[PDB]
Design a protein around this ligand. Sequence first.
Ligand SMILES: CO[C@H]1O[C@H](COS(=O)(=O)O)[C@@H](O[C@H]2O[C@@H](C(=O)O)[C@@H](O)[C@H](OC)[C@H]2OS(=O)(=O)O)[C@H](OS(=O)(=O)O)[C@@H]1OS(=O)(=O)O
Ligand SMILES: [Cl-]
Ligand SMILES: [Cl-]
Ligand code: NA
Lengths: 341, 35
Amino acid sequence: GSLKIAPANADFAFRFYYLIASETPGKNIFFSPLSISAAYAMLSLGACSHSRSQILEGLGFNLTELSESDVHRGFQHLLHTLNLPGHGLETRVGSALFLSHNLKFLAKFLNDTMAVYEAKLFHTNFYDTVGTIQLINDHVKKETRGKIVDLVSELKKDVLMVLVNYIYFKALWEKPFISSRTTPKDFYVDENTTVRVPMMLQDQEHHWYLHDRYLPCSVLRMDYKGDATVFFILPNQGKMREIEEVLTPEMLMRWNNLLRKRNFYKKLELHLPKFSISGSYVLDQILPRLGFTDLFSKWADLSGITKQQKLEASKSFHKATLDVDEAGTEAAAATSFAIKF
Amino acid sequence: NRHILRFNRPFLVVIFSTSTQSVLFLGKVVDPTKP
Ligand SMILES: CO[C@H]1O[C@H](COS(=O)(=O)O)[C@@H](O[C@H]2O[C@@H](C(=O)O)[C@@H](O)[C@H](OC)[C@H]2OS(=O)(=O)O)[C@H](OS(=O)(=O)O)[C@@H]1OS(=O)(=O)O
Ligand SMILES: [Cl-]
Ligand SMILES: [Cl-]
Ligand code: NA
């Protein structure tokens, strides 16, 4: 099972969303919570004492209910499952450590990251800032089939390690759209702002959807070929904030369970845009407000990575992209975490 | 018109792994003509 870690991961997902949505309202948002969670859980293998438990608590783990071993083995199983072959669904998740050519890293840390997160180890010269940025960014770009470019946008000269992970997702719709029916249509951004978008249309299929009687929204769940689904949640005009206030793991499960009853499987005329959005986040600036003050402070104990220098957190980035069209969805993301001395 | 959905105003997106019960991606489309 990776079911033991599912509650914490979902809690983190919705906490992160809520912070972004409330701090930058009226803006496109897109991220991979799984990528962030897995990056930071991997990092925690190198943290000691209070710093280790605080990273896991920030990620939503209840360390009275779960052992550290339950968390890490949960991720190992989660990542293994995602990486297994599928017919009309590609999911790949991977990790890497870019290690200073000079420094002696603790074998336990390196061994644990390889055993649990299947981390690939690369050696690089962090004095060569330009070359190291290119090496890391090219690796992420390649692993994301070109979607995540320039993940690491800054790198200090005193960095000795950069942790990265990535997720790549490409999945066909069970119920695809016929591209000859896609035509430009109006999209009402707000009361005064209207843009044109290619609008896909299907009207012959049954779909899983509801008009919520407790909340001002409708919810569509579309299945992919393979073990994935997407919820498209459509607040009534002007009611986005009201839905965001209640967007929790419990609400997602409510909607999911309502959409397991065949009375919510009905013929639907569905207009859905063909579109792309992306997100780009500076996690070292955001995560202190989601429980990670210790990690980003002068007090962080990262002495599980090396005994050779006193280490501290440097920059941490997250970028993600979403591409929706008539055949399916492509989504990619990556997370970096740099450590300096 | 209860059998129609038009995603022609801001909406939320939750991509979910049903084998691992993980939220893989989460987001909001406010203006889809920003890449
Ligand atoms: C806003 O509450 C009203 O709608 C509820 C359903 O809204 S929805 O979750 O967006 O579909 C309705 O309860 C329904 O919920 C079922 C469930 O628990 O899964 C089931 O228990 C109810 O049937 C026994 C079902 O009622 S129905 O859809 O009207 O057939 C609420 O009804 S309730 O009798 O108060 O529980 C509720 O209706 S009302 O108070 O506005 O008349
Ligand atoms: Cl840095
Ligand atoms: Cl009908
Ligand atoms: Na499926």
